[PDB]
Amino acid sequence: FGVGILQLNDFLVNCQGEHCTYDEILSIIQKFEPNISMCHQGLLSFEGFARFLMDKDNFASKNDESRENKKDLQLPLSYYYIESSHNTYLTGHQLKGESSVELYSQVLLQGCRSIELDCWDGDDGMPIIYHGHTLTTKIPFKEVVEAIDRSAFITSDLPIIISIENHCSLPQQRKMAEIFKSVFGEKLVAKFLFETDFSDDPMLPSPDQLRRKVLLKNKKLKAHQTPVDILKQKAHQLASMQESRQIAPELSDLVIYCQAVKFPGLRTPKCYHISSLNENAAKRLCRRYSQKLIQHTACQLLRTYPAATRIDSSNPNPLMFWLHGIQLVALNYQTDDLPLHLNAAMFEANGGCGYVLKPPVLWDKSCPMYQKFSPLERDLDAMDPATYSLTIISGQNVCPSNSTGSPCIEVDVLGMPLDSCHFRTKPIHRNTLNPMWNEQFLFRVHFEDLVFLRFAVVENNSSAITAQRIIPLKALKRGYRHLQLRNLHNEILEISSLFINSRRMEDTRPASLMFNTEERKCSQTHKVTVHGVPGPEPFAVFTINEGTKAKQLLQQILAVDQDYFLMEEKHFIKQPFQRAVGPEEDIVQILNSWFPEEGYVGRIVLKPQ
Ligand SMILES: [Ca+2]
C-alpha cells in the first residue's frame, strides 16, 4: 500500500541527495500522509509520495538558503568577483534618455558594490553627472553622493567602490572632494587603515576588514622626487601661455586602495593599482595572455566595461572575464538581457552581499591546477569530467497569457568553452499550461565552479522567450525538484515553473579534485547515511567533509567504547553488490560514484570482520 522508512531513505539519499534521520523521515510521512493508520505504521502512500515531490516548497536552488560566510570574506579584495554597475546614472540609451539619481539607490539596495560617477562642470561651480557631449539630462553631483550614503549599506555592509570618470576642472574637483568628506564622513577611506598595508609584500585588505567603507577609484597624483622638480614643472606651465589630465590634490589624497592607471600591460605598491578596460581590449587580453591575466587578477583588481559601440546599453557576456578572474564586470543594470541575468545568478552566492570568493584555481597556490589552467583550452586530457543528467519532465503556465502557444525549453550550459553546450526539447502542440516533455540531456563538465544552467521557455511559433531562469550548476539540488521561472525582467512569475530531475556521477583523476584545495575539501560539509550502526534506529547520519576518508569515518562511528570495516552495498530492483571499503579511501567520492535510476540504491554498511 505504501513506502516504508528504510525505502524512503534509500530514495532520498540516492535521488535527492538528502541524508535524513529515522525521525525527520517519520516527520515527512506525518506531513504528507493524511490517512492516520498508514501514518501510525510508518508508510507514505503512493499518492502521498507524489504530493511530497510535487509540493511547491521542493525548490531547485540551494541559494534560497545561502548567507554571508565571515571566513569566506577574510581574503584579499582581489580574490573576489565584485558586483559592478556601468554608467549607473543612465536609465536607457547611452546617448539619449534620462539620467536618474534614484538609480544609484536601486542598484545599491540590490547588493551591487561598484557604481560609476561621470563628473563634469556645472555652470554654477558645482559638479554635475551626465554622459559627456550627448543629449543625456544632467543630475547634480551632490544629490548622487547623498543617494549613495543613504543606500550603500541598507542591504549589505560590504565595502563599495565608487568609479569616478573625472572630467571636471580643478575648482570643481575640489568641490567633489569636500562633498565626499562632508557626506560619507568616517565611512570614506581617506588613509591606509591596516597593519598589513605597511608590510614587505602588501596585498589589498579583506572585504570583511572594510565593512561600512567607501573606496574612491580616481587617478592619483604621482609623487615628485624633490622640491625643485615641483617648482620647475610650475615654471614650465607658466612659460607656455598667451578624462582630464590635471587632478586636484584635495581629491587625489582620498584615493588609497584603488589608484586608477592607464593599463601598463602584463612607486606605489602594485596591489593598490586598478585599470578599466573596454570589453574589446579585455577580450584581446583574455585570448592572448590567458594564464598571465589570471596571475595578474590574483594580486590586483581589474574592471571591464561595455564597449562604446553598445550605444543601446546592451551588455557583454561576463563569463569570459570571470574565468580569467576579472573582479569588476560592469554591466548596464537598466537593460534586461541574458548577461544581466548571469550577473544576478553569480551574486545570489554568499547571501547576495555582492562579494563572491573566486574558484581557488585563480589564486590558491595549493590547487593542483594553479598556473596550469587556461579556460579557453580544450586539451584537459589529464582529467575525467563529472557526468550530469538533466530531465525536463514538465512545466506549468510556461507562457503567461498564451494558453494556446507551443512551447519548448532551451537549456544552455554556460562555462568555459569545453563545458558549454545547448539543448532544446520538442515543441508541445498548443499547451503552455501543463506541457509534458520528459526529455533528458547528458553533459560532462570539468570546471564545476563557474558553470551556469540557463532554462528558457521558447514559444515555437513567434520564437519568443516567455520565461527564463539561470542557476549556478553547483547550486542545483539533485533529484526531482521545482524550478521557479521568471519573466524577462528577472521578476518571479508566481505560478509559472518547470519540474526537473538532475543526477551527477564521477567515474587519470576526477576534475572536481584537480580544481580543489585540501582546505576547501575539509571545509565543505557533506552528510553520509550508514546502516548497521549499533543503536536504536536502523540507520544513523554523520556530518563529514569531502576530504574525510573511510578510516576517519570508522573512528567517528566507533570511538565511544562499545575490527570493523565499511561496506559499499547496492540493492537492486537479485543479490546485493558488496565491496569492502579501503581504509585510505575518500567517502564522498564513493557517494558520487553512485548514479540513481539505474536499478540500484546505494548504501554504506558497518560489518564485523
Ligand atoms: Ca561612462
Residue numbers in the entry: 1303 to 1544, 1638 to 1661, 1729 to 1969, 1975 to 2029, 2037 to 2047, 2056 to 2091
Provide the publication's sentences verbatim:
The enzyme has also emerged as an important regulator of cardiovascular function because it is required for maximum cardiac contractility, and changes in its expression or activation result in cardiac hypertrophy and heart failure. As an integrator of signals from diverse signal transduction pathways, it contains regulatory elements distinct from those of other PLC enzymes, including a unique X–Y linker, a N-terminal CDC25 domain, and C-terminal RA1 and RA2 domains.
There are four copies of PLCε EF3-RA1 in the asymmetric unit arranged as two nearly identical dimers, although there is no evidence of dimerization by size exclusion chromatography or small-angle X-ray scattering. In each chain of PLCε, the first helix of the EF3 subdomain (E3α, residues 1284–1303) is disordered, potentially due to the absence of EF1/2. Although residues 1969–1974 are disordered, the rest of the linker forms two short helices that interact with the TIM barrel and C2 domain, burying ∼800 Å2 of surface area. An amphipathic helix (residues 1529–1541, hereafter referred to as the αX–Y helix), is found in all four chains of the asymmetric unit, and a β hairpin (residues 1621–1631) is also observed in one chain. Superimposing the RA2 domain in the H-Ras–RA2 structure (PDB ID 2C5L18) with the RA1 domain in the EF3-RA1 structure shows that the predicted G protein binding surface is occluded by EF3/4.
